[PDB]
Design a protein around this ligand. Structure first.
Ligand code: IHP
Ligand code: ATP
Length: 1011
């Protein structure tokens, strides 16, 4: 049913149940403006079963600046907008069935037909009809989920209503957590101690279940409500009547579906529940709602939007707002600034804000149709007032329409900023879904369309994949395996033929820094990143800091996302921020003492790596190095020691010669992994073995394993052996057919297979946590002689040909299901889980964890893209510091967090002289200029005498070190030995602290010029 090859990322987000719920459901969408178009695109990407778009308007030239499917031909033909776009929308997802309608909505229009839709979304509608439709929807049985959203210039309104009661199945959709129990007290209420340095991160009132408790078997399977006492403690209710705590136990999070209560739209006017996006001005959203209501009343009164530059319109609107505020529950003070700006820009349309609101509202429709997350209750008022705020007091000439496609945007931000936008030269790194949305935004904004200066540069090396069609909407299935940037630029050309773009198929890295040299950065104005990993982000941040250019970064996963802004001399840089690295699983944990399913899947993954990539490559490279097995035999006979040769030889002795031999090898490997390991470990540690403190060695987090009895009939075992045999045949270049995987043939083979008996040994076990993988074990001469015997055996059997010395080397593909990599990893991890009494995991979760595939969804991408576009608008405007806003959000709650960005910090070194990360010093001079002259020039220009000198690793001068103090006589070029290609050289200096003996305070990097 569910096309994982298409849906896998969002499948990791919402869950297969959600997909089977967007299936069988039907949604009605009306308005088909820019906002409605965004909704429709987001939903069809998401894969809702069927969508009915509605629009009665005719095509206009004004619609072209906000619609990326309309063309001038459609306006010429005066077609219906929905009719024109219907063909293009269906291209995004053929699985969805899409219909169009144009029945005008009015007072006499009957709404009974709407019952076929479980959710209704309205855009570009007059308010009383919205009231009527909301009433009809919420009066239905079941009530139709109602969503309204509007955009007016820089202002936007979003509203939601799912009826008076709505059941949210999953509140926020995270993985439930598990915490090992350190101790439980017998008290009323009993208090449970978590494992030390493992905080539970829970909430008072949350519900937990328990299992494996030694002592309290009764609460194993019980559910209690907690009351957080400490990060490692909380009360769980009375335990006095119970047994003493012995040991063990694990508490597990319990999810409970909840009920959320909405209100009718008309009633919500007086008492609007408003989500907060900036806690510094919590009352502002109420002001925004008041202003929008005043605009609605204005449109009711005059059948038109207020006109820019009309002082009478602004006065009337302010009067209306003041009258309306008196009718409000709280009666907030009317903000004249908001009213003035709305009157100035009511008729405009700002595309990025519309895109962001569209993404958010679409995610709300997903919430409505699935119950997967807590919905909005009930209002949202996003805005970009800061953009026009920096404009001071402009006039209408900037915003007067000029007959072009950009008239809506011009009415928003004025023509001069449009000119600047068309003249921008933008470098975009990475062209993922975020990149595609940025391209769409630029095309809508006309960025770079100016032939004078405009140029959009983008680069990305990866090819298009079917799995990327879900989010990277610019592409089509016939674009698979083609360069991403090329197809993206081609598609963007369709959106805006005036645009100018240059695509590259290159990864951004220090190796490619030659092409992306500092001059190339100098030509650019802005840098936008749609990267996936952090290291590339830090490298790009270093390049941006070197070239002193603004940089915008964003990252998304699941419903969570964030946007961050860097401005020279204004903000801190990404590398300034630092975090602890990702947690490395302990070597003893992953090798011998797993405790979580993640440990087992990790073990499966690296065992797969060793068995199919690493070891075969070692074998092949070894035989590339050494010509013949007889040569190796001669060398070993003459006492030669070749690193890892012994493993190569043992590999040779293990080479199967037919499919049945591969099957036998797989069976033996199964035995070794899941039977012999447990037996060996238990021989080393019986369940009754105890520590010196008298406690049992086997306790949490350690888990005593058990050998697994082989079973041909087990489907898990069948899949495991099948994938193993397939992989081994692939590596050893042994052909086969699918009938070889039949249980009949496998049973036939295994009837002859004899299993060698287990033999316990006494290998040293790195049971300690701190232990890590050591060096190679010194192979005894007995093992060497055994290998020699096997070697001459192979030589006599003539098994020394080039084919014997060559084998296939694989790579971990995850998207192709037929290679069986995912199947093998799943089988191995599940089997290892049963060894340690751990519940198995499904295939999709296994693929997610092993491949480290980040869950993603189109709505979050669109929203973060809109935010990034707004911030790029601000930085291109050269706005003051306060305008720029870092933002973090989580659609699950949902929650939006705006904040002022991190201000750059200034560090004083001496005499009040302070500098920043942005600052770099420069000097000029001559060849015969000396180091002492350099010190003097520094003390002159910057009022401070250098105390130590280093150029990279060339540790140049310190007064205290004897042999280098005399270098002050030497000139620069003979001393540092620079590369003459440059006219200069860069250097790092620090200054002795005001209190001597402390560390020298480092200054900014300084570049000295030879001339
Ligand atoms: O070399 P690795 O892939 O890291 O794994 C090795 C390997 O097992 P595989 O053969 O299945 O890869 C060893 O066997 P050889 O390659 O040397 O034949 C085996 O040693 P034994 O054959 O003596 O069991 C050893 O087990 P250990 O490290 O416990 O001695 C095991 O390590 P892991 O299974 O933990 O990776
Ligand atoms: N150093 C780099 N230079 C150029 N492009 C890069 C670099 N690092 C990452 N990218 C690009 O960043 C993009 C990130 O977008 P996205 O998450 O859609 O990637 P993906 O590989 O298609 O997806 P997935 O991570 O789900 O496999 C990738 O398409 C990748 O090509």
């Amino acid at each position: 049913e569910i096309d994982d090859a298409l849906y896998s990322r969002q499948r990791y987000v919402l869950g297969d149940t959600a997909m089977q719920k967007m299936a069988k459901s039907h949604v009605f969408l009306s308005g088909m403006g820019g906002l409605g178009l965004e909704i429709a695109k987001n939903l069809v990407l998401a894969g809702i079963k069927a969508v009915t778009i509605h629009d009665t308007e005719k095509c206009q030239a004004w619609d072209l600046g906000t619609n990326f499917f309309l063309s001038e031909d459609d306006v010429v033909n005066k077609r219906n907008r929905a009719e024109a776009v219907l063909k293009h929308i269906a291209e995004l997802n053929p699985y969805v069935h899409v219909t169009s309608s144009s029945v005008p909505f009015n007072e006499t229009t009957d709404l009974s037909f709407l019952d076929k839709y479980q959710c209704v979304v309205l855009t570009e509608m007059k308010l009383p009809l919205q009231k009527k439709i909301n009433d009809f929807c919420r009066s239905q049985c079941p009530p139709i989920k109602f969503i309204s959203a509007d955009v007016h210039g820089i202002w936007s309104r979003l509203f939601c209503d799912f009826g008076d009661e709505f059941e949210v199945l999953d509140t926020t959709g995270e993985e439930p957590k598990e915490i090992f129990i350190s101790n439980i007290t017998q008290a009323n209420p009993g208090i449970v101690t978590c494992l030390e340095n493992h905080p539970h991160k829970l909430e008072t009132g949350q519900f937990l279940t328990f299992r494996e408790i030694n002592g309290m078997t009764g609460l194993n399977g019980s559910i209690q409500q907690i009351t957080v006492i400490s990060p490692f403690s909380f009360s769980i209710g009375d335990t006095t009547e119970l047994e003493p705590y012995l040991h063990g136990g694990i508490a597990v999070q319990v999810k409970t579906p909840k009920t959320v209560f909405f209100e009718s739209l008309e009633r919500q006017l007086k008492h609007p529940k408003c989500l907060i996006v900036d806690f510094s001005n919590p009352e502002a959203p109420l002001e925004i709602h008041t202003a929008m209501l005043a605009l609605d009343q204005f449109q009711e009164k005059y059948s038109r939007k207020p006109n820019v530059g009309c002082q009478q319109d602004s006065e009337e609107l302010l009067k209306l707002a003041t009258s309306i505020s008196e009718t409000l529950e709280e009666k907030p003070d009317v903000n004249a600034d908001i009213v003035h700006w709305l009157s100035w820009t009511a008729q405009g349309f700002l595309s990025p804000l519309a895109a962001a609101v569209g993404g958010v509202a679409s995610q709300e429709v997903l919430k409505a149709v699935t119950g997967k997350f807590s919905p909005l209750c009930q209002w949202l008022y996003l805005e970009a007032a800061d953009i026009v705020e920096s404009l001071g007091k402009p006039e209408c000439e900037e915003f007067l329409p000029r007959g072009d496609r950009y008239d809506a945007l011009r009415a928003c931000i004025g023509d001069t900023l449009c000119q600047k936008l068309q003249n921008l030269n933008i470098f975009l790194v990475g062209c993922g879904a975020i990149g595609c949305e940025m391209l769409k935004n630029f095309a809508l904004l006309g960025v770079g369309t100016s032939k004078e200066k405009g140029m959009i540069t983008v680069t990305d090396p990866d090819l298009i994949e079917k799995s990327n069609l879900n989010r990277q909407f610019l592409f089509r299935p016939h674009h698979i395996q083609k360069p991403k940037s090329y197809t993206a630029a081609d598609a963007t050309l369709k959106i805006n033929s005036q645009i100018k773009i240059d695509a590259h198929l290159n990864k951004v890295c220090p190796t490619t820094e030659t092409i992306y040299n500092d001059e190339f950065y100098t030509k650019q104005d802005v840098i936008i990143t749609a990267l996936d990993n952090v290291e590339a982000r830090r490298y790009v941040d270093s390049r941006c800091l070197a070239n002193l250019r603004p940089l915008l970064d964003s990252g998304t996963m699941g419903t969570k996302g964030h946007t961050e802004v860097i401005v020279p001399h204004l903000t801190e840089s990404y590398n300034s921020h630092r975090d602890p690295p990702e947690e490395e699983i302990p070597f003893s944990t992953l090798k011998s003492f797993p405790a979580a399913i993640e440990h087992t899947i990790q073990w499966a993954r690296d065992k797969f790596e060793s068995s199919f990539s690493h070891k075969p490559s070692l074998f092949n490279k070894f035989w590339q190095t050494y010509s013949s097995a007889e040569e190796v035999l001669q060398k070993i006979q003459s006492g030669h020691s070749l690193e890892g040769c012994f493993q190569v030889i043992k590999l040779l002795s293990r080479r199967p010669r037919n499919w049945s031999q591969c099957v036998e090898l797989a069976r033996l490997k199964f035995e070794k992994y899941f039977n012999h390991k447990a037996l060996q470990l238990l021989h080393c540690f019986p369940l009754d073995i105890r520590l010196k403190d008298g406690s049992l060695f086997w306790q949490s987090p350690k888990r005593p394993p058990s050998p697994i009895k082989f079973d041909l009939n087990e489907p898990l075992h069948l899949s495991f052996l099948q994938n193993a045999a397939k992989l081994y045949a692939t590596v050893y270049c042994i052909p086969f057919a699918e009938e070889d995987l039949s249980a009949d043939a496998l049973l036939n083979i295994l009837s002859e297979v004899k299993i060698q008996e287990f033999k316990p040994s006494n290998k040293v076990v790195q049971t300690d946590e701190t232990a890590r993988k050591p060096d190679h074990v010194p192979i005894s001469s007995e093992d060497e002689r055994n290998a020699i015997f096997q070697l001459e055996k192979a030589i006599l059997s003539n098994e020394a040909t080039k084919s014997d010395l060559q084998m296939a080397v694989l790579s971990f593909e995850k998207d192709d299901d037929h290679n069986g990599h995912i199947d093998f990893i799943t089988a191995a991890s599940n089997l290892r889980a049963k060894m340690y009494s751990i519940e198995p995991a499904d295939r999709f979760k296994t693929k997610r964890i092993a491949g480290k595939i980040i869950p993603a969804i189109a709505t979050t991408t669109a929203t973060v893209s809109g935010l990034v576009a707004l911030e790029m608008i601000k930085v291109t405007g050269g706005y003051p510091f306060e305008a720029y806003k870092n933002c973090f959000l989580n659609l699950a709650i949902p929650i939006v967090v705006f904040t002022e960005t991190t201000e750059v910090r200034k560090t004083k070194i001496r005499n009040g002289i302070s500098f920043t990360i942005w600052d770099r010093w420069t000097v000029h001079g001559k060849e015969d200029f000396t180091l002492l002259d350099f010190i003097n020039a520094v003390k002159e220009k910057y009022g401070i005498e250098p105390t130590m000198v280093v150029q990279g690793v060339k540790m140049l001068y310190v007064p205290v070190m004897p042999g280098h103090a005399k270098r002050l006589k030497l000139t620069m070029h003979k001393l540092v030995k620079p590369t003459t290609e440059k006219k200069y050289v860069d250097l790092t200096v620090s200054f002795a602290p005001d209190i001597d003996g402390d560390e020298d305070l480092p200054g900014p990097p300084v570049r000295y010029y030879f001339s």
